[PDB]
Write a protein that binds this ligand. Structure first.
Ligand SMILES: CCCCCCCCCCCCCCCCCC(=O)OC[C@H](COP(=O)([O-])OCC(O)COP(=O)([O-])OC[C@@H](COC(=O)CCCCCCCCCCCCCCCCC)OC(=O)CCCCCCCCCCCCCCCCC)OC(=O)CCCCCCCCCCCCCCCCC
Ligand SMILES: CCCCCCCCCCCCCC(=O)SCCNC(=O)CCNC(=O)[C@@H](O)C(C)(C)COP(=O)(O)O
Ligand code: SF4
Ligand code: SF4
Ligand code: SF4
Ligand code: SF4
Ligand code: FES
Ligand SMILES: [K+]
Ligand SMILES: [Zn+2]
Lengths: 263, 360, 126, 176, 208, 96, 48, 113, 95, 114
């Protein structure tokens, strides 16, 4: 075979050429923190959360984008990997709004959870945060853009899976806004799935909005009947009442998406 | 008149506490410990807190440790007032009950000033204590301690040299040292037998290696030397309270790890990291690294221990609670042989038995 | 000798104290739980779980609370492998069904594929 | 570092033996105990005149629950369900929806006061000081379901006790 | 790592490691594992045929003298075929030390009672009968200690539900407290709290 | 405190103690019920520099237990610790 | 007030004989105290 | 000097502690000679028992013998000698120097699961 | 801002009122249905819109640490005010 | 498949122990009816004993029936020594419990349970 040997924390693993650092760490059972990487979207590399130390190399690499070279020792838990994660989590939480009680992502937030797991416990940002104009992209997806961390899973999903090309980033620098630039209504057949992949509560479900909260929901694994695809879903209920419908991953059917009628 | 066999049937207050701990988080399971030895609330809080802090590999700040030792000895005064005065009340001496429950009312006022509840404070937490001392509390603890020795002296006037009290205690419930060690006795039940053992001295916790006190040791293994050991432990608790009021350090009262102890409400409303940590510590809770500890304190009834098993989640996988009264009431059958029926209530009094911790 | 040979199927259903209604009319589901698609973390997809079929929840006439009569409605069990869950359900007389573990298949990722000379996989923006 | 309670040998000279015999025959310690009981007879008792005199409480006191408001009449509760997540006895039942002005508000805020352990984890989990555990402890009922508070009862407890609750929070918020 | 981190006790770790080697080589017939935790607690994981010989050793040997039985504990772990983990916490007052002796059983294999070694165990393993269903051979009076008298089921087993299967009420027809199947007016609300992110990389298990 | 000196003298004679020096009822010696507002200090981790969480992470320094022995010469017999030092009798009040 | 009385006797209320339509001449009640006097009477503050 | 009490309830004072300890230590060694030589219990118990017996034979005093045997009172040193004797008599019957009777199952001591 | 159903029952600020044929009105027979007559939706509408001269405003609810967490509201829309998600106060850029 | 026994090496010793436990319960039923002053007959109590013994009559494992005999001896000791009250004896007679629907059609009429 053409498998190259790399090392994750000293453990040998045989990987295909072209495999990234993140996938090599996944093959030894370690999940690198990420915000913009998504395994069904194109590699962006613009949140810098996956920065990891390769040893004998004085610069961290973006594990979601960097291919492994033969003989690398990926240090997923070293001192400068943790310092990189804390610095990037500090910059993500600098201008992020204190909305966790009134945000629907609370409890099932990637930003909350891997701030608890990989960032620090306190703030140094002594300034005033930014605030972003909200957008009206339709009756399904509520949009609160102050919570946006600009990971561009919006744009990659709408471009590559939904095939729409109507989301994007306007502006430049810290005023860079994810949006449509116009009053445009993002109504695709797969338009609600951006609620899934948005790691923050910038894009939430407008019908699910404010009604429940993820830890109190019971997760019943079930099947879509809205068409003959047979999409695997999670009906999340709460005290004998159906709260919402999430997808299940099935690699051969619905990869991890569902349609808007299903959702 | 003699007692041949004593079979204590228990479980009348079995509540399934430590199964209810398995479906709750660590902060959520803390107020079950107020309700086990329900005269020794903050001590059981301390034993659970030390167990969780040992499994979390963190330590409380020094002022939190001095507050825990101060309120542990206030709590020890509470429990030995309860012990001695109900042990005298069941025998017939009903008057120092009322004389000492006013002092016990004032120590419940201390609990309520520091936490908001008179008994179940939920005040000693994993990471420190919940809230700092309000201003003027240490002055009133000093005003209590300055007068409490006279209360012990008039209790000891009413009971110690009383020949009716000595007839009901001196040759009653004699426990040898080897049988006390084999029956799992702890605390005063060992110390009346002459065993020199005290977990505040031998296996010390928060700042008990920095306070100076004495351990009262019995000679005859009976109800009367255990009475004298509890009276002298009230004396030494007053001594430790004086040393805690003089050596109270400045500083913070929670550990300054905001992934374990919740942040301040002023910075929860200002900082993003603090709001996230407040959110996750009050909804999920902190994850405890996997492992099993047996953390024991010298509670006022004896060795109070928690065998806490964590699986890496925010909820205890297992929390076994060792109470002193469980092994004490198991040894009741040996301690009551060769005695009378009216001696059985005195032996149930000299074993300080609260059935909340006995039954869980 | 001090060891006996019991060639029978392991069955503890007479010893568990579970009433018959909650042994023979229950369907245990043995499954690895799906990843919550609100999140990219996978640490909840590492163990096998056993749950039961959800029974009736109705409205409390006084408060509108969720009244139940199912004792097993919260019983979720954790198992290291699939065979431990199967053996625990067979030992307890529970009729079970097993869903196999769905792993994500290994994707082919390339950052340079975002900028191909002649393939459709160019990103229109980045 | 230890001391011996009760390891005294009594003196066997005729003076001490006659002292112990005068104690045995003349009941000297029994008169000592009667003297101490007589000494409390002439003390002022510690008895307060309830209900006209009240036990001293602190501003931290954890009594009856109340949902609070802002100084505009808007209720502080923004339906985040942190109080029912932290609630050790699961006494808090919350249902929410966006109301007519789109605000995140509850449609159900129930507290079973007979499950409640009065530990105040809800008022310290609350990010906006909405639920508090106020100063009322005299709210005994004649019926069990009178201790099953809904959102209307809790908002009325807030409107009832707010003048006192705000001052207690004003006293204790710098310790929190 | 000074103020907020627990100080590590290396001396006790080395001493308990030396004594764990000591016990493992004096008793190789029953000792399966020996481990010392990071907070310096020694665990001797033994075979269940050596409950009496190991506990008699630690109680009576002149280098051990673990004269006190602090606590006796079972743990239900249903993923193991020997699901019950019997835990003996022991205290040596002479050497001021604590040891943990751990063994295992399933629902049907009896564990030998340790009342001949420690009389303190007389109620503890009795409770392990009541709460877990572990039978203890040659116990003097083995019966239930905490549950109600007609109680079916061993409650601290993890397949036992939180509320039970029955609930009591007074019935005025029969003039008697009766037991009925449990119906909750409010169901216990199960919270799925566990984060999907790895918290402790030092405890990462090797994947399949 | 309002007892007449005749009753106060009878009371001190009957108890045998000067009871007025140590009264069990509280008077103006106690703290005010209204206190000035505190300014509580912050802990050691309230710093703007050299305050990385990885350098003070207590939960992530906990390790799995070191397996000393597993079943997969003239060395000294050891004990779990040194023998306990004999306790010393109190210089304060030994009752001896 | 009477600050010569001991702590607990030093503040008290003489209840009204009629509150909210109910005769309270004999039926006095601890919950009759309004909240602004409930801090003072329960000694949560020095200030009426 | 004839110590009046041991301080422990039910542990009676020994009139001749040196001779009782010599009898108990030689009896422990006589019982311990019936254990195989490679057994670690025999090697370790012979080592500590010969150390204690040489300390007893080297010191005529009772107080100094207590402070250098370092096991508390001399009567509980006698009690520990009786406990070691009873233990070694049981260790002959148990034969715990044998190999391990049974390996555990493969994930029996794996925590967490 | 309480109204009344044709059954004579006060509609709560949620909007809850029992139907006429609902038996659960019998719990209020001889007793009362406790409603709160200070509707927060009617009281937050009574507040004046704060005219500020900035583009991003911060709200904490007033009182400093006695309010809600401090959020930042953008005021770029001149069509609509910027409402605080916690306290419901609303803000308008004065230009 | 070599397991450690509890009391019985095989099923015949186990049936001996089941039989002696049934003899002890059969002797105990009139005393239990008398001193707990029950409202049942001695024949009805012996019917309940026979019903509870026949409930477990399908077990083929010696260790499981050893634990069943042990638990029956424990219940018998709780009955002879008067540790149970009247209520614990009468819990075998599910009297205040209404009879459940048994066929398909009445279970269809009342709800959703199979
Ligand atoms: C002995 C017979 C009784 C003699 C009177 C007596 O001893 O009065 C207590 C009086 C005060 O004693 P205290 O306990 O120090 O009182 C302190 C109070 O704070 C001082 O008392 P106060 O500050 O509370 O003042 C108010 C108090 C004033 O108290 C009195 O007027 C005392 C009662 C007088 C009758 O009045 C009341 O509270 C009204 C009570 C009305 C009923 C009293 C009983 C009547 C019994 C016969 C019917 O005792 C003395 O002055 C010494 C003993 C005198 C004996 C005289 C020779 C016989
Ligand atoms: C008044 C109320 C009191 C109620 C009394 C409750 C007693 C509960 C004790 C339960 C003990 C048992 O049921 S152990 C029986 C289980 N035995 C077996 O599984 C082995 C099979 N046994 C049988 O078939 C038995 O009928 C015999 C008599 C041993 C053999 O019969 P086969 O031949 O035909
Ligand atoms: S997106 Fe996440 S971190 Fe941001 S406010 Fe919502 S829950 Fe909090
Ligand atoms: S709205 Fe969400 S998915 Fe879109 S770029 Fe922002 S953070 Fe990413
Ligand atoms: S005080 Fe405690 S038990 Fe009561 S509602 Fe609040 S969190 Fe729940
Ligand atoms: S009372 Fe507070 S914690 Fe509870 S849901 Fe409302 S805002 Fe959240
Ligand atoms: S995940 Fe690699 S940079 Fe965003
Ligand atoms: K989202
Ligand atoms: Zn606001």
């Amino acid at each position: 075979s053409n498998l190259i040997e790399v090392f994750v924390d000293g453990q040998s693993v045989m990987v295909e050429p072209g495999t990234t650092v993140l996938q090599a760490c996944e093959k030894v059972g370690m999940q690198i923190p990420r915000f913009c990487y998504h395994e069904r979207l194109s590699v962006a590399g613009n949140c810098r959360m996956c920065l990891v130390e390769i040893e004998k190399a004085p610069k961290v690499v973006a594990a979601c984008a960097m291919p492994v070279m033969k003989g690398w020792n990926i240090l997923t838990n070293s001192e400068k990997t943790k310092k990189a994660r804390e610095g990037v989590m500090e910059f993500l939480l600098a201008n992020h709004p204190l909305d966790c009680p009134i945000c629907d992502q609370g409890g099932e937030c990637d930003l909350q959870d891997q701030s608890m797991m990989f960032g620090s416990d306190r703030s140094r940002f002594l300034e005033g945060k930014r605030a972003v104009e909200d957008k009206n992209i339709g009756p399904l997806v509520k949009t609160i853009m102050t919570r946006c961390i600009q990971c561009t899973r919006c744009i990659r999903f709408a471009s590559e899976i939904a095939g729409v090309d109507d989301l994007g980033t306007t502006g430049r620098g810290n005023d860079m806004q994810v949006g449509t630039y116009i009053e445009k209504m993002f109504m695709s057949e797969l338009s609600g799935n951006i609620i899934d992949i948005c790691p923050v509560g910038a894009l939430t479900s407008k019908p699910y909005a404010f009604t429940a909260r993820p830890w109190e929901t019971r997760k019943t694994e079930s099947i879509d009947v809205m068409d003959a695809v047979g999409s695997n879903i999670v009906v999340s209920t709460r005290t004998g009442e159906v709260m919402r419908i999430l997808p299940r991953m099935h690699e051969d059917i619905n990869e991890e998406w569902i349609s808007d009628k299903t959702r | 008149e003699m007692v041949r066999k004593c079979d204590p049937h228990i479980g009348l207050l079995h509540r399934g506490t430590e199964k209810l701990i398995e479906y709750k988080t660590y902060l959520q399971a803390l107020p079950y410990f107020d309700r086990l030895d329900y005269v020794s609330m903050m001590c059981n809080e301390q034993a659970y807190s030390l167990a969780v802090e040992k499994l979390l590999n963190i330590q409380p700040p020094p002022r939190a440790q001095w507050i825990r030792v101060l309120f542990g000895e206030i709590t020890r005064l509470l429990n030995h007032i309860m012990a001695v005065t109900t042990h005298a009340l069941d025998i017939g001496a009903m008057t120092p009950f009322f004389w000492m429950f006013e002092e016990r009312e004032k120590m419940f006022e201390f609990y309520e000033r520091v936490s908001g509840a008179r008994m179940h404070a939920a005040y000693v937490r994993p990471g420190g204590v919940h809230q700092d001392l309000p201003l003027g509390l240490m002055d009133d603890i000093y005003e209590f301690s300055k007068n409490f020795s006279l209360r012990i002296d008039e209790l000891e006037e009413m009971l110690t040299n009383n020949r009716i009290w000595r007839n009901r205690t001196v040759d009653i419930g004699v426990v040898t040292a080897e049988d006390a060690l084999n029956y799992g006795f702890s605390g005063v039940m060992l110390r009346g037998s002459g065993i020199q053992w005290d977990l505040r001295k031998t296996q010390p916790y928060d700042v008990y290696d920095q306070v100076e006190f004495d351990v009262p040791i019995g000679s005859r293994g009976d109800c009367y030397d255990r009475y004298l050991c509890r009276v002298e432990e009230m004396r030494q608790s007053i001594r430790i309270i004086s040393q805690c009021l003089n050596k109270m350090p400045p500083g913070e009262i929670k550990v300054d790890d905001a992934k374990v102890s919740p942040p301040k409400r002023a910075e929860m409303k200002t900082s993003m990291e603090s709001l996230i940590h407040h959110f996750k510590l009050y909804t999920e809770g902190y994850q405890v690294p996997p492992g099993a500890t047996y953390t024991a304190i010298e509670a006022p009834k004896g060795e109070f221990g928690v065998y806490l098993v964590s699986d890496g989640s925010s909820r205890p996988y297992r929390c076994k609670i060792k109470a002193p009264g469980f092994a004490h009431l198991a040894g009741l059958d040996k301690m009551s042989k060769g005695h009378m029926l009216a001696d059985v209530v005195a032996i149930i009094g000299t074993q300080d038995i609260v059935f909340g911790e006995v039954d869980r | 000798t001090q060891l006996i040979t019991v060639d029978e199927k392991l069955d503890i259903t007479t010893l568990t104290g579970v009433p018959e209604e909650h042994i023979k009319t229950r369907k245990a589901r043995i499954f690895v739980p799906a990843r919550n698609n609100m999140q990219s973390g996978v640490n909840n997809t590492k163990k096998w779980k056993m749950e039961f079929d959800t029974r009736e929840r109705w409205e409390n006439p006084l408060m509108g609370w969720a009244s139940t009569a199912d004792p097993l409605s919260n019983l979720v069990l954790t198992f290291s492998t699939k065979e431990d869950a199967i053996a625990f359900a067979e030992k307890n007389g529970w009729s079970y069904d097993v869903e196999e573990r769905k792993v994500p298949k290994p994707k082919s990722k390339s950052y340079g594929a975002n900028f191909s000379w002649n393939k459709r996989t160019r990103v229109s923006t980045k | 570092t230890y001391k011996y309670v009760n390891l005294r040998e009594p003196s066997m000279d005729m003076k001490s033996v006659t002292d112990r015999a005068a104690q045995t025959l003349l009941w000297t310690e029994l008169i000592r105990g009667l003297g101490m009981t007589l000494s409390y007879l002439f003390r002022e008792p510690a008895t307060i005149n309830y209900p006209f005199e009240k036990g001293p409480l602190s501003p931290r006191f954890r009594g009856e629950h109340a949902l609070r408001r802002y100084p505009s009449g808007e209720e502080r509760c923004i339906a985040c369900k942190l109080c029912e997540a932290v609630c050790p006895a699961q006494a808090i039942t919350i249902e929410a929806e966006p109301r007519a002005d789109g605000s995140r508000r509850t449609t159900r805020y129930d507290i079973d006061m007979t499950k409640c352990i009065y530990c105040g984890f809800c008022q310290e989990a609350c990010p906006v000081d909405a639920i508090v555990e106020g100063p009322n402890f005299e709210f005994s009922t004649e019926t069990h379901e009178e201790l099953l508070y809904n959102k209307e009862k809790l908002l009325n407890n807030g409107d009832k006790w707010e003048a006192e609750i705000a001052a207690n929070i004003q006293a204790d918020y710098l310790y929190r | 790592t000074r103020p907020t981190v627990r100080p590590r006790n290396d001396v006790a770790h080395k001493q308990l490691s030396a004594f764990g080697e000591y016990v493992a080589e004096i008793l190789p017939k029953y000792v399966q594992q020996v481990q010392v935790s990071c907070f310096s607690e020694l665990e001797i994981c033994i075979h269940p045929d050596g409950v009496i010989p190991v506990l008699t050793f630690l109680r009576d040997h002149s280098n051990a003298q673990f004269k006190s039985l602090a606590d006796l504990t079972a743990v239900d772990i249903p993923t193991r075929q020997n699901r019950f983990e019997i835990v003996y916490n022991l205290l040596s007052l002479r050497f001021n030390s604590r040891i943990r002796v751990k063994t295992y059983t399933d629902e049907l294999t009896p564990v030998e009672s340790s009342v001949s070694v420690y009389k303190a165990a007389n109620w503890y393993e009795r409770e392990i009968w009541d709460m877990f269903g572990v039978f203890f051979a040659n116990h003097p009076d083995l019966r239930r200690i905490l549950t109600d008298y007609g109680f079916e089921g061993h409650p601290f087993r993890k397949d036992f539900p939180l509320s039970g299967y029955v609930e009591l009420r007074y019935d005025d027809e029969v003039k008697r407290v009766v037991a009925e199947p449990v119906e909750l007016a409010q169901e216990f609300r199960k919270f799925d709290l566990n984060s999907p992110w790895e918290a402790f990389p030092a405890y990462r298990q090797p994947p399949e | 405190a309002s007892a007449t000196r005749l009753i106060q003298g009878l009371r001190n004679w009957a108890s045998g103690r000067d009871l007025q020096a140590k009264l069990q009822l509280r008077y103006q010696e106690i703290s005010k019920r209204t206190q000035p507002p505190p300014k509580l200090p912050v802990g050691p981790s309230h710093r703007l520099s050299n305050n990385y969480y990885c350098a003070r992470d207590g939960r992530r320094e906990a390790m799995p237990p070191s397996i000393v022995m597993s079943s997969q010469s003239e060395k000294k017999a050891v004990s779990p610790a040194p023998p306990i030092k004999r306790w010393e009798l109190s210089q304060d009040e030994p009752y001896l | 007030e009477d600050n010569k009385q001991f702590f607990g006797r030093h503040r008290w209320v003489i209840y009204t004989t009629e509150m909210n339509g109910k005769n309270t001449f004999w039926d006095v009640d601890g919950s009759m105290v309004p909240p602004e006097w409930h801090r003072w009477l329960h000694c949560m503050t020095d200030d009426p | 000097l004839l110590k009046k009490t041991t301080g422990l309830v039910g542990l009676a004072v020994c009139e001749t502690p040196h001779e009782r300890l010599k009898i108990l230590y030689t009896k422990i060694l006589d019982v311990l000679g019936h254990i195989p030589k490679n057994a670690a219990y025999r090697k370790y118990t012979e080592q500590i028992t010969n150390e204690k017996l040489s300390i007893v034979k080297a010191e005529p005093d009772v107080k100094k013998l207590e402070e250098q045997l370092q096991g508390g009172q001399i009567e509980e040193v006698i009690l520990q000698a009786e406990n070691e004797l009873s233990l070694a008599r049981k260790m002959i019957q148990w034969k715990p120097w044998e190999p391990l009777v049974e390996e555990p199952p493969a994930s029996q001591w794996k925590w967490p699961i | 801002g309480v109204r009344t159903s044709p059954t004579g029952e006060k509609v709560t600020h949620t909007g809850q009122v029992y139907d006429d044929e609902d038996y659960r009105r019998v719990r209020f027979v001889g007793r009362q249905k406790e409603v709160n007559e200070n509707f927060a939706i009617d009281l937050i509408a009574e507040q004046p819109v704060s005219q500020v001269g900035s583009r991003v405003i911060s709200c904490d609810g007033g009182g400093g640490a006695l309010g809600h967490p401090r959020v930042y509201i953008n005021l770029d829309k001149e069509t609509k005010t910027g409402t605080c998600g916690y306290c419901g106060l609303q803000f308008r850029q004065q230009h | 498949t070599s397991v450690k026994p509890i009391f019985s090496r095989d099923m015949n010793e186990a049936k001996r122990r089941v039989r002696e436990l049934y003899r002890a319960w059969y002797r105990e039923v009139p005393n239990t009816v008398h001193l707990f002053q029950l409202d049942i007959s001695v024949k009805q109590g012996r019917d309940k004993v026979r019903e509870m013994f026949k409930k477990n009559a399908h077990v083929t494992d010696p260790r499981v029936v050893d634990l069943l005999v042990i638990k029956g001896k424990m219940e018998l000791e709780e009955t002879i020594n008067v540790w149970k009250q009247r209520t614990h004896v009468m819990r075998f007679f599910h009297e205040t419990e209404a009879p459940r629907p048994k066929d398909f059609l009445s279970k269809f009429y009342v709800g959703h349970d199979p």
